Design a protein around this ligand. Structure first.
Ligand code: RET
Ligand code: OLA
Ligand code: OLA
Ligand code: OLA
Ligand code: OLA
Ligand code: OLA
Ligand code: CL
Ligand code: CL
Length: 260
């Protein structure tokens, strides 16, 4: 059902996808140690934001690791090219995992924004819009080989949820940044633009079967996911952590003031 299963891969292409995924694991588990150790320097009001990055690191790290092992299980070097064997490789597992990682990324943003009834109501609408976007995207990617028109349609429905979700995010950011301490009102605007850039890479990767239906396209989609994953989880995570420690320090939390 996926474009990955259509082609044989050169040693170069196969190895590069393997390296990308393996690097992904490395980066997320390395970042996982950073967030764990710096969590002691975050005040109790914001400590869950740092804990959420740890959850994200392990979740994304486990899926990338599963993808890497599935990649190597599925293909073998036969007559000069990596060819598909008994098992299959699919990007479908990422979609399933986004059901958990996307709410996590959104929740840590809400915490550093100083959201408190307001927090539960905003989290529910965000998670429902996020699940709507993920589910419609998952259905759409089932047709990336058999029905391009269907991929485009479910993609349009997914984009509508993405846009409304982004509008909720931006509205809350640009409204609640005045509550933010230690000059983090400036930082949070950059986090908004970082999310807009990084999350927009996922629907681009989704559209790869439409404009680059070949093995090089398979490499590109994995490259795009790698850039997007590192930017949206790791880089985003580090900015959320800085915002949490800076605000904690401005709020009189001694470990944060000493660590800075
Ligand atoms: C760490 C993983 C993250 C931040 C996943 C983000 C996923 C998206 C922003 C999903 C985007 C999609 C569209 C807006 C349309 C096509 C289908 C999707 C689900 C790939
Ligand atoms: C086999 C894969 C190779 C392993 C790559 C992991 C090497 C670690 C390098 C970058 C990971 C990103 C984590 C950044 C540490 C946080 C410190 C900081 O930037 O403030
Ligand atoms: C790899 C992991 C090595 C363990 C280092 C992390 C120590 C955590 C200490 C703490 O902050 O409680
Ligand atoms: C609630 C919104 C969810 C879905 C909207 C329905 C439109 C997608 C149907 C496309 C399937 C098809 O091509 O037959
Ligand atoms: C901010 C996210 C950074 C992600 C780092 C990705 C590292 C790879 C970047 C550039 C190397 C490009 C190498 C060219 C690939 C050749 C494809 C092939 O093997 O056939
Ligand atoms: C070229 C590679 C891209 C740059 C690498 C990005 C690494 C870390 C950025 C996250 C750090 C948090 C923002 C800085 C906060 C500040 O010092 O004001
Ligand atoms: Cl506190
Ligand atoms: Cl993920």
């Amino acid at each position: 059902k996926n474009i990955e299963s259509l082609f044989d891969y050169s040693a170069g292409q196969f190895e590069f996808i393997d390296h990308l995924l393996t690097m992904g694991v490395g980066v997320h588990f390395a970042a996982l140690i950073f967030f764990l150790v710096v969590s002691q320097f975050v005040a109790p009001k914001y400590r869950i934001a740092t804990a959420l990055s740890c959850i994200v690191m392990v979740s994304a790290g486990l899926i990338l690791n599963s993808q890497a092992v599935m990649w190597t299980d599925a293909y073998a070097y036969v007559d000069g090219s990596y060819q598909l064997q008994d098992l299959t490789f699919s990007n479908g597992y990422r979609y399933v995992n986004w059901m958990a990682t996307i709410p996590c990324l959104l929740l840590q943003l809400l915490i550093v924004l100083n959201l408190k009834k307001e927090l539960f109501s905003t989290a529910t609408w965000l998670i429902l819009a996020a699940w709507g976007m993920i589910i419609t995207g998952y259905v759409g990617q089932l047709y990336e080989v058999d029905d391009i028109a269907q991929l485009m349609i479910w993609g349009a429905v997914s984009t509508a949820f993405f846009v409304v979700m982004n509008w909720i995010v931006g509205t809350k950011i640009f409204k609640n940044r005045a509550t933010m301490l230690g000059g983090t009102d400036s930082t949070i605007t950059k986090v908004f633009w970082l999310m807009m850039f990084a999350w927009t890479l996922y629907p681009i990767a989704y559209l790869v079967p439409a404009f680059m239906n070949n093995a090089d396209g398979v490499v590109l989609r994995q490259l795009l996911f790698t850039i997007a994953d590192i930017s949206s989880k790791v880089i985003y995570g580090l900015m959320i952590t800085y915002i949490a420690i800076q605000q904690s320090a401005a709020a009189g939390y001694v470990p944060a003031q000493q660590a800075l």
